[PDB]
Write a protein that binds this ligand. Structure first.
Ligand SMILES: CC(C)CCC[C@@H](C)[C@H]1CC[C@H]2[C@@H]3CC=C4C[C@@H](O)CC[C@]4(C)[C@H]3CC[C@]12C
Ligand SMILES: CC(C)CCC[C@@H](C)[C@H]1CC[C@H]2[C@@H]3CC=C4C[C@@H](O)CC[C@]4(C)[C@H]3CC[C@]12C
Ligand SMILES: CC(C)CCC[C@@H](C)[C@H]1CC[C@H]2[C@@H]3CC=C4C[C@@H](O)CC[C@]4(C)[C@H]3CC[C@]12C
Ligand SMILES: CCCCCCCC/C=C\CCCCCCCC(=O)OC[C@@H](O)CO
Ligand SMILES: CCCCCCCC/C=C\CCCCCCCC(=O)OC[C@H](O)CO
Ligand SMILES: CCCCCCCC/C=C\CCCCCCCC(=O)OC[C@H](O)CO
Ligand SMILES: CCCCCCCC/C=C\CCCCCCCC(=O)OC[C@H](O)CO
Ligand SMILES: N#Cc1c(N)nc(SCc2ncc[nH]2)c(C#N)c1-c1ccc(O)cc1
Ligand SMILES: CCCCCCCC/C=C\CCCCCCCC(=O)O
Ligand SMILES: CCCCCCCC/C=C\CCCCCCCC(=O)O
Ligand SMILES: CCCCCCCC/C=C\CCCCCCCC(=O)O
Length: 388
């Protein structure tokens, strides 16, 4: 069979290529948020915790991965730490992603209270807590859910390992029920599904809010039509009680538009509760000069912001769908290894490829920002032009 240093040299070189890009891309993210106070929101503190976990993939997890494919003689628990450190960092990224979905959900659903609820100080406390939980979850095998107690000793003597040592291989020290049940199903897959729901709720609340907005608009204008085209005084009253309510509704330079608007409706309602039909129909035309000059322009900045929230949460959902794509192959292969012991194990080369793919996720997030977030892309250019 072919000398394995040939296939390894390829896998290593690829891994190092990827570590290089991971560091750069994600240092630039971080340098970006540091420098551009437009990018200094709570949402982006999570983006930074995400970029830092990806820098750490290049600086550490990927060298660890290179190390543990050699099979080098190593004390079992030390081999377990270099095997598990990547699980810690990946768990950090799930928490950061979930935090971002939730943040964006709070932002669209209770925009009024978002500044007072989601503050820079609570964000940073959540980030710290999640990093501690990621170390706990990711290094749980250290605490005894491992295969250290049953070393492959024929394989350790074949390699001259010291007494106390193992060939340091991932599938030899980390149990596959840990990886399938605990790490995949419960600590990755369940969080992804969750993140998937949150984003459904965001797109629904935006879809609904925009609906309400353009409904209200049409109440405003159809009740005007009812008024031009009545010839009876209690018709006009009925249509202005409705206009009025549909105005204190949409309420919740801006306010002088609704001040005027409800005022003119209070003017015209009052004519109409006197029987002056024509006097009130031409009073309820004064509204139209007020819609044209104020209400249409609140309609429109409010639609603008919702379309911006929607587009932002699609950008962020793409970050989560690419996480899924990069990591799923590897889990899906572990599922086969574990659930079908009748099946031949996936070949070495594919293991290599699933692992490499999982690591490329540490290169995608920076490209996403740059293609999808005008403020990150403008800031990427300033840094790239001024320094290179
Ligand atoms: C601040 C950063 C750079 C610290 C990096 C520390 C890393 C490189 C260290 C910390 C703990 C170390 C491990 C501790 C124990 C063992 C068992 C031994 O039989 C082989 C080496 C091995 C597997 C070590 C490899 C290197 C290691 C993972
Ligand atoms: C998320 C997207 C990209 C889908 C991922 C599909 C990949 C991971 C799937 C599709 C077909 C799968 C293979 C189908 C059959 C076998 C034979 C078995 O003896 C070992 C596992 C192995 C080799 C599977 C490994 C995982 C596999 C390659
Ligand atoms: C949305 C999707 C990607 C969620 C995850 C799907 C996973 C859990 C599913 C998709 C395909 C499934 C595999 C399909 C075929 C086999 C072969 C059988 O002998 C053991 C179960 C096993 C190995 C399944 C395990 C679970 C599996 C890997
Ligand atoms: C080695 C492993 C990882 C490197 C960690 C990188 C840590 C990133 C620090 C940069 C930072 O705080 O910038 C964002 C702030 O400006 C937000 O207000
Ligand atoms: C040594 C092992 C390294 C671990 C990963 C390093 C993680 C360091 C934490 C990064 C998260 C971060 O910086 O979040 C703060 C945010 O910017 C608020 O302003
Ligand atoms: C910035 C910081 C740089 C990041 C750290 C880089 C590499 C860590 C991985 C190195 C682990 C190598 C262990 C090899 C070993 O111990 O091999 C002995 C064995 O007994 C057979 O000789
Ligand atoms: C959520 C998806 C969970 C998918 C769960 C897949 C379970 C597969 C299974 O139970 O496989 C049994 C097999 O017979 C073992 O030998
Ligand atoms: N599974 C799994 C798994 C595995 N069997 N091997 C390795 S490295 C040994 C090796 N390198 C090339 C061929 N074999 C790694 C790593 N890192 C994982 C792994 C596990 C969880 C992750 O979040 C990321 C990666
Ligand atoms: C996905 C990202 C880019 C993929 C690059 C190609 C994958 C890197 C190494 C996979 C092939 C390594 C082994 C080649 C065959 C020889 C062998 O397996 O021993
Ligand atoms: C800095 C980047 C370093 C990258 C990888 C270091 C890999 C160490 C290889 C383990 C030694 C193999 C052995 O002794 O059998
Ligand atoms: C910046 C710090 C760089 C840290 C050192 C990097 C990699 C060390 C490579 C480990 C070599 C193992 C030798 C194995 C052996 O000789 O048997």
């Amino acid at each position: 069979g072919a000398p394995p240093i040939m296939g390894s040299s390829v896998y290593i070189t690829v891994e190092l290529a990827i570590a290089v890009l991971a560091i750069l891309g994600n240092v630039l993210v971080c340098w970006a948020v540091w420098l551009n106070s437009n990018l200094q929101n709570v949402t982006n503190y999570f983006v930074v915790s995400l970029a830092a976990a990806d820098i750490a993939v290049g600086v550490l997890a990927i060298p660890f991965a290179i190390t543990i494919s050699t099979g080098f003689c190593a004390a079992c628990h030390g081999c377990l730490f270099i095997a598990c450190f990547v699980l810690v960092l990946t768990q950090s990224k799930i928490f950061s992603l979930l935090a971002i979905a939730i943040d964006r959900y709070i932002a669209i659903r209770i925009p009024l209270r978002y500044n007072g609820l989601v503050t820079g100080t609570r964000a940073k406390g959540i980030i710290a807590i999640c990093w501690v939980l990621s170390f706990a979850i990711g290094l749980t095998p250290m605490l005894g859910w491992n295969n250290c107690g049953q070393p492959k000793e024929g394989k350790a003597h074949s390699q001259g390992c010291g007494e106390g040592q193992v060939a340091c291989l991932f599938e030899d020290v980390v149990p596959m029920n840990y990886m399938v049940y605990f790490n995949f199903f419960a600590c990755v897959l369940v969080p992804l599904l969750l993140m998937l729901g949150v984003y459904l709720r965001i797109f629904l609340a935006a879809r609904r809010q925009l609906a309400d907005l353009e409904d209200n608009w049409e109440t405003l204008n159809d009740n005007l039509k009812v008024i031009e085209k009545a010839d009876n005084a209690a018709q006009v009253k009925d249509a202005l009680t409705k206009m009025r309510a549909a105005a204190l509704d949409a309420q919740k330079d801006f306010r002088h538009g609704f001040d005027i608007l409800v005022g003119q409706i209070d003017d015209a309602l009052k004519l109409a509760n006197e029987g002056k039909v024509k006097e009130a129909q031409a009073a309820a035309e004064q509204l139209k000069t007020t819609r044209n000059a104020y209400i249409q322009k609140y309609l429109e900045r409010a639609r603008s912001t919702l379309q911006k929230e929607v587009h932002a949460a699609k950008s962020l959902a793409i970050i989560v769908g690419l996480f899924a794509l990069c990591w799923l192959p590897l889990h899906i292969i572990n599922c086969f290894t574990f659930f079908c012991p009748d099946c031949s194990h996936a070949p070495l080369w594919l293991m290599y490829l699933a692992i490499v793919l999982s690591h490329t996720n540490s290169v995608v997030n920076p490209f996403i920002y740059a293609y999808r977030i005008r403020e990150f892309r403008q800031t990427f250019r300033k840094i790239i032009r001024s320094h290179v």
